[PDB]
Amino acid sequence: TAVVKNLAKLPAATSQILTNVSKLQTFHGLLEERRDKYAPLAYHTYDNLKQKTTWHPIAHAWVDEGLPVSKKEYNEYCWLKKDMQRLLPLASPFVFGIYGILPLAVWLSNDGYLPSAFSSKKDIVSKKLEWYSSYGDDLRQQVGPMLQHRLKRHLRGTLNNEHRLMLDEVTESYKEIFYSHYTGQLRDVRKCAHLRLYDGTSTVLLLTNKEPVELTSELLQKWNAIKAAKLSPEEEKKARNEALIEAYKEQELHGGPHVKHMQGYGIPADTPLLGENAKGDQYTQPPESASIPLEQLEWTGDTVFIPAEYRTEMEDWGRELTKLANQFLLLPWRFVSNAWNQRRLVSWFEEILQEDALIAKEGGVQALSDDELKVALLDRAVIRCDEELTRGDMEARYKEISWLMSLRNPFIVLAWQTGYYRSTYSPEDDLPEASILPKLNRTVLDVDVHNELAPDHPEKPLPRVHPALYPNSHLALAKEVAVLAK
Amino acid sequence: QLKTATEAERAAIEADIARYQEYLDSDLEKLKQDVAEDTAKKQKLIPLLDRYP
Amino acid sequence: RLHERRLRGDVIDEWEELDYHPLVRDDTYLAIDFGDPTFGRYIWKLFPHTDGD
Structure with missing residues (x-):
C-alpha cells in the first residue's frame, strides 16, 4: 500500500x-x-x-x-x-x-x-x-x-x-x-x-507635524512625478511639502478630511477648558503644533490606511x-x-x-x-x-x-x-x-x-x-x- | 477655432498646428508613416480577436 | 426526461425530482447546510417588481 x-x-x-x-x-x-x-x-x-x-x-x-x-x-x-x-x-x-x-x-x-x-x-x-x-x-x-x-x-x-x-x-x-x-x-x-x-471610501491619512492630510490621486501623481524627476532631496522635500500644504488647503476648503463624518472614526476638536480653567470665551485649548507656522508643514513619514x-x-x-x-x-x-x-x-x-x-x-x-x-x-x-x-x-x-x-x-x-x-x-x-x-x-x-x-x-x-x-x-x-x- | 479656445485647449491646438506644419514641411511623409503605424496596429489587432478561426 | 415519467403516472420523490435540477439542487443543499429556512425578501430585492407581492 x-x-x-x-x-x-x-x-x-x-x-x-x-x-x-x-x-x-x-x-x-x-x-x-x-x-x-x-x-x-x-x-x-x-x-x-x-x-x-x-x-x-x-x-x-x-x-x-x-x-x-x-x-x-x-x-x-x-x-x-x-x-x-x-x-x-x-x-x-x-x-x-x-x-x-x-x-x-x-x-x-x-x-x-x-x-x-x-x-x-x-x-x-x-x-x-x-x-x-x-x-x-x-x-x-x-x-x-x-x-x-x-x-x-x-x-x-x-x-x-x-x-x-x-x-x-x-x-x-x-x-x-x-x-x-x-x-x-x-x-x-x-x-x-x-x-x-x-x-x-478607503482613505490614507498622511501624518504631518501639524495635522493629518487625506491622500488623493492628484497628490499621488505629483509625488510620483517628483520621484521620477530624480531631484536632489533639498528640492524633493520642498516640492513634497508644497504639494502637501496645497492638498491641506484643498481639504480645508472641502470641509476637512472624510474621516470626520464617518461613524466609528473621527478627529477630535481642540480640548475643552473645565470650570475655572475656562478663560472667558476661550473654551478651548489648541495643541502645541498650533504655534508652528503652516509654511513649515512637513510629512512625518507616517501613514494610516483606513479601508472603512x-x-x-x-x-x-x-x-x-x-x-x-x-x-x-x-x-x-x-x-x-x-x-x-x-x-x-x-x-x-x-x-x-x-x-x-x-x-x-x-x-x-x-x-x-x-x-x-x-x-x-x-x-x-x-x-x-x-x-x-x-x-x-x-x-x-x-x-x-x-x-x-x-x-x-x-x-x-x-x-x-x-x-x-x-x-x-x-x-x-x-x-x-x-x-x-x-x-x-x-x-x-x-x-x-x-x-x-x-x-x-x-x-x-x-x-x-x-x-x-x-x-x-x-x-x-x-x-x-x-x-x-x- | 483657436480664437474661442481656453488656455489648455489653446496650447493643445497650438501643438496640433505645429504637428500639421511638421506634416507640411515633411510633405506628408510623417503623416503617411503614422497612418502606416495605425494600420499596422489594427492589422495586428484583428487576427488576435479571432477566437474561433 | 423527468416529466416523461410523471406523465406515465409514476410517482417521483421530491428529492429524486430535485436531483434532475442539479444547479438548484446544489444551492438548495447549501441553504440546508446553513440552516436558514426563511425566504422572500431575497426575492423582493433581486426582483423589485415583486416587492409587496
Whole structure:
C-alpha cells in the first residue's frame, strides 16, 4: 500500500528534507535582509472589540519591487514553507509517547498530507501539479460552493433581513457574480469590484507635524512625478511639502478630511477648558503644533490606511467563514483564532502579489510554460484540473485575478474564485450529451480593466461591450498586442 | 477655432498646428508613416480577436 | 426526461425530482447546510417588481 510505499523512501527523504531546510534558511535570511531595510513597519492593530489582532493586505502584504530572485526560486520558498507546515506530525511521538506513532502512520498513509521529499518527481512545478491533481483540487472542490454560500449569506444576512441589509444598486452585479453557474455566461471582474459599494471610501491619512492630510490621486501623481524627476532631496522635500500644504488647503476648503463624518472614526476638536480653567470665551485649548507656522508643514513619514470596510472587514466575518476561506486556499485552519488565520491568508496574499511582480519582471504570463501557468492558476484557485482550458483562457483568467488582487480585498477575491468551482453531477448517463461547439477560448484582449463600468440598475442589466469596440482601442491595447503577436 | 479656445485647449491646438506644419514641411511623409503605424496596429489587432478561426 | 415519467403516472420523490435540477439542487443543499429556512425578501430585492407581492 501507500504506507509501505512511503516507508520504503522514508530513509531517502530525510536528506532531501534537511537540504530543503537549509535552502529555506538561506532564502529567508536573504529575503529578511532585504525586507528589514526596504519595507516599512506595519504596526499591529486590534479589532473593534480590542482583544485580537486584525490584518489587511494594504498594510501588511509588502511587495519587494526589485527582488533579485527567480520565480521558480520563490515557488520553492513557498512550497517548502508549506512542507514545514506539513512536517508537524513528527512532534506527536515527542509529546504523546511511543504510542504516538499511529498519528505518524496516518500521516504517511495519504501522500497529500506529506512534503515534497516523498514524491518521485523532481521539478518543483511537476511536483506541485501532482500534489494538486492528486489531493488539493479535490479538497478545494468540496469547500468552494459552501464558501460561496457563506459569502452570499454574509452580504444578505440571516433570517430574511435582506430589505434591511442589502443594497439595491449592487443587485445585478451580485446576481452576475453569484449565479453565473445558472446561465453559463462569463463574468466581468468589474462587476465583482462593484461589491465594494457595501463598504465606505478607503482613505490614507498622511501624518504631518501639524495635522493629518487625506491622500488623493492628484497628490499621488505629483509625488510620483517628483520621484521620477530624480531631484536632489533639498528640492524633493520642498516640492513634497508644497504639494502637501496645497492638498491641506484643498481639504480645508472641502470641509476637512472624510474621516470626520464617518461613524466609528473621527478627529477630535481642540480640548475643552473645565470650570475655572475656562478663560472667558476661550473654551478651548489648541495643541502645541498650533504655534508652528503652516509654511513649515512637513510629512512625518507616517501613514494610516483606513479601508472603512463596514460589511467586508475580516473581523466581522466570523469563526466559520475564515476557516472555510483557509480550507479553500489550502491553508492551515484548525484550532486557531481568526486573527491567526487572517495572518495566514494575508501571507498567502503577499506571496501571490510578489509572484505576480516576479512574473511581470520575467516578462509576463506568455514567457511561462503551460504547466507553469496551470500551477500558477491552481495556486490562485481559479482553475480545477477537470477543465482543460486553453492558453488564452488561462492567461485571461490570470490577468483577471491579478487585477482583482491588486485591489487588496479578500472578500471579492473569494467571490471571484468560488465561481469557478460550481460543478454538478447528472443523474443520467446519456445526459449531458456530447457538445458540438469547440472549447471556450479567450485572449488577454477580452479583459476590460482599462475602462470604468457603472453599476447596472436593478432589473435593467446591460450587454457586455468588448474592449475592441471602444475608441482608440488599437492604441490602448498596443502593449498587449505587441506581447501577443511577439 | 483657436480664437474661442481656453488656455489648455489653446496650447493643445497650438501643438496640433505645429504637428500639421511638421506634416507640411515633411510633405506628408510623417503623416503617411503614422497612418502606416495605425494600420499596422489594427492589422495586428484583428487576427488576435479571432477566437474561433 | 423527468416529466416523461410523471406523465406515465409514476410517482417521483421530491428529492429524486430535485436531483434532475442539479444547479438548484446544489444551492438548495447549501441553504440546508446553513440552516436558514426563511425566504422572500431575497426575492423582493433581486426582483423589485415583486416587492409587496
